[PDB]
Paper text:
[name] is a giant, elastic, sarcomeric protein with a molecular weight of more than 3800 kD. [name] consists primarily of two types of protein domains: fibronectin type III ([name]) domains and immunoglobulin (Ig) domains (ca 100 residues in length) that account for over 90% of its mass.
Domain [name] also presented such typical features without detectable deviations. In the present study, we clearly showed that the single antigenic region of the [name] [name] is its middle [name] domain, [name]. In another two Western blots, four more anti-[name] sera and two HC were also tested with the same result. These results suggested that the antibody epitope in [name] is formed by a linear sequence motif and is not the result of a three-dimensional, spatial arrangement of amino acid residues with specific conformation. In brief, structural analysis did not lead to the identification of unique features in [name] that might support its unique recognition by anti-[name] antibodies. An analysis of sequence conservation relative to [name] used as negative controls in this study reveals a subset of surface residues unique to [name], that could mediate its specific recognition by anti-[name] antibodies.
Numbering used by the authors: 1 to 99
Write the structure that this text describes.
């Protein structure tokens, strides 16, 4: 419910490769009143409407997203979790392309 952390801050991507990107972020301002336990990473190709889980329960401020396809544009969103589930998502600023 409303025990939701705020969004992670400064979601950014770098270190692009043939098949991966490296996301980094900072902790949310509000943890929802319960300690943060991890982050959840989702992705979607820009032309599809569906978000897809990449990894949950990430205990870091970063994640290398694997198995990305050359020629596709991708979006990513990260949410912080606490014991009551994930909070509001942070979004990348622009899609990631591949080549
Ligand atoms: Ca680390």
């Amino acid at each position: 419910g409303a025990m939701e952390p705020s969004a992670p801050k400064e979601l950014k991507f770098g270190d692009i490769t043939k098949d991966s990107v490296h996301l980094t972020w900072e902790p949310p301002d509000d943890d929802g009143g319960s300690p943060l336990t991890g982050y959840v990473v989702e992705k979607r190709e820009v032309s599809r409407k569906t978000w897809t889980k990449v990894m949950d329960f990430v205990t870091d401020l970063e994640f290398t997203v694997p198995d990305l396809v050359q020629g596709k544009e991708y979006l990513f969103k990260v949410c912080a979790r606490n014991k009551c589930g994930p909070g509001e998502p942070a979004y990348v600023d622009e899609p990631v392309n591949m080549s």
